[PDB]
Design a protein around this ligand. Structure first.
Ligand SMILES: [Zn+2]
Ligand SMILES: [Zn+2]
Length: 565
């Protein structure tokens, strides 16, 4: 490990030699500590148009070394015992099988510089020097060394991210975890489709639907998980394999991290730590690898439930042919009984033995959130109540009687995130264009929420019609950004929910917003609506005044549209 992280530690120790020191009283328990050195937000438009939520802490409650240290000590400075050898044998077998299924109709490839550039443009990438540094680190990797692939507690230098993209980006670009290729994956599906996936699963004969969340998934990715994820390199030709093995072994299996920590009299230090497991969040293929390993975990849980695996198999896997047979016979059926998106999963097992199939799950360190370790899981009878990707999904009916299945979540989080501006010296223009992005996203996905349809229409009425939406409104890969457009949102709504919606049999267009339904009031309120409560009523009654205010701020000379009418 030390020989692997060596030149990175040296490269930092020398960039910072005059302030470099070793803190004997550092707080790191499960990370290797190597030394330290000395170290150095509201969207106004949305806020002006969402006054009732100024006093809603669920909304308003949404950098400092003092915080990073706290979250590090409680979340990341932890360790889990190794799984037993039999458990590890099962993990390796299932991983090998799954990789071979995923690669049956797809071949790994190197992703290109121009792919990365084009993906970025949707100008460090248009400096030759950047690519000189990149080529440089690359030849280091090809020689068997790493100088500069270091995490900031988990952001990374754009060059390192390009090398990762080059070696493993194919998993994303060629949709290895798409539902067609993986059975249980959902990569490429939007929030406008996931609900249909859950409904489909609800129809499969079997037990309840289970959606257990793992407590701190990324922190419970083991070195064995990483080794099993690395098995994809066996499907690569040798050069590609060299690049990928470099990325995995020097960046995944042996990571170096810089993290901030408070010092004396307002001063700040940077600590350099390292370890050999856990997932570095926010890497290029973090999502794909999380999806992979979660699929493996659920397959194993099903095998325990169905009594293919027994207690004795934890210590040492006796006859492994039973595992191979179960995978070849039932593997794909079980995969199609899953919806897995990174660390999130829903499973429809063949019966409810799944609920108490916990031995391998717990031995793998994948302990369930908010539950006693050996308390059986509780599943759902009603697919519309199942949590998945921070949402639940409801069937609603258009005025003409056709049904749609829509994404829903507690409203406070949506409004709270829309109020956040990532910039600083952000003009009214960038602020307004971001507000417009949120509004149009709500029009596409959360139109069925009264407060959000109203607020979105006010925002869209307060921003010049020709201003193009900018910024990002979600980190979920299932928010596909169809709303990032100046195209009319009813047209976009039709394309998303009718035209290109395979679960919409009748392709008759919807020609007005009033034909598009809300949740029932009970449901709207349950999920955080303020309909009926006085500040919200006042807000709605005054909304045109407020819109005119924002218009006067941005400029009365601009062209505005009335989406409130
Ligand atoms: Zn490197
Ligand atoms: Zn809801």
């Amino acid at each position: 490990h030390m020989k692997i992280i060596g030149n990175r530690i040296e490269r930092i120790r020398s960039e910072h030699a005059e302030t470099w020191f070793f803190d004997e009283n550092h707080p790191y328990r499960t990370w290797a500590y190597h030394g330290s050195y000395e170290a150095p937000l509201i969207n106004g438009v949305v806020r002006l148009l969402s006054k009732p939520w100024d006093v809603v802490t669920g909304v308003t409650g949404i950098t400092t070394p003092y915080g990073q240290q706290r979250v590090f000590k409680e979340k990341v400075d932890t360790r889990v015992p190794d799984p037993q050898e039999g458990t590890r044998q099962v993990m390796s077998m299932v991983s090998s099988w799954l990789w071979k299924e995923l690669g049956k109709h797809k071949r790994p490839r190197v992703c290109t510089k121009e792919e990365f550039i084009n993906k970025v443009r949707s100008e460090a990438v248009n400096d030759p020097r950047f690519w000189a540094l990149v080529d440089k680190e690359r030849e280091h990797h090809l020689r068997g060394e790493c100088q500069s692939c270091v995490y900031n507690m988990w952001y990374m230098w754009l060059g390192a991210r390009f090398l990762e993209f080059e070696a493993l980006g194919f998993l994303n670009e060629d949709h290895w975890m798409g539902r067609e290729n993986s059975g249980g994956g959902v990569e490429g599906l939007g929030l406008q489709r996931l609900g249909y996936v859950l409904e489909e699963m609800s129809r499969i004969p079997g037990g309840r639907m289970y959606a257990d969340d793992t407590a701190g998934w990324d922190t419970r990715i083991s070195r064995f998980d990483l080794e099993n994820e690395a098995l994809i390199t066996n499907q690569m030709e040798k050069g590609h394999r060299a690049l990928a093995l470099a990325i995995i072994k020097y960046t995944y299996q042996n990571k170096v991290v810089k993290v901030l920590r408070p010092a004396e009299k307002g001063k700040t230090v940077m600590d350099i730590i390292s370890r050999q497991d856990q997932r570095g969040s926010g890497q290029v293929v973090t999502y794909a690898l999380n999806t992979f390993t979660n699929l493996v975990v659920q397959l194993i849980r099903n095998m325990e439930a169905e009594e293919v695996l027994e207690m004795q198999d934890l210590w040492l896997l006796r006859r492994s042919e039973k595992v191979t047979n179960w995978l070849q016979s039932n593997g794909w059926d079980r995969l199609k009984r899953m919806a897995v998106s990174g660390d999130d999963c829903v499973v429809k097992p063949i019966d409810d033995r799944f609920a108490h199939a916990l031995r391998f799950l717990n031995d793998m360190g994948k302990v369930r959130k908010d539950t006693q370790e050996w308390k059986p899981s509780t599943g759902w009878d009603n697919w519309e109540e199942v949590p998945f990707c921070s949402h639940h999904f409801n069937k609603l009916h258009l005025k003409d009687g056709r049904s749609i299945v829509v994404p829903c979540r507690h409203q406070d989080e949506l409004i709270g995130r829309a109020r956040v501006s990532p910039g600083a010296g952000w003009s009214i223009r960038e602020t307004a264009c971001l507000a417009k992005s949120y509004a149009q996203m709500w029009q596409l996905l959360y139109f069925h929420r009264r407060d959000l349809r109203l607020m979105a229409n006010a925002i869209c009425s307060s921003v010049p019609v020709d201003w193009v939406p900018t910024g990002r409104t979600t980190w979920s890969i299932h928010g596909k950004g169809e709303w990032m457009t100046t195209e009319d949102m009813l047209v976009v709504w039709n394309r998303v929910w009718i035209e290109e919606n395979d679960h919409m049999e009748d392709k008759t267009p919807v020609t007005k917003w009033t034909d598009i339904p809300y949740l029932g009031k009970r449901e709207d309120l349950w999920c955080g609506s303020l309909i009926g409560h006085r500040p919200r009523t006042t807000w709605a009654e005054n909304i045109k005044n407020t819109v005119n205010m924002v218009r006067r701020i941005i400029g009365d000379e601009e062209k505005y549209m009335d989406y409130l009418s």
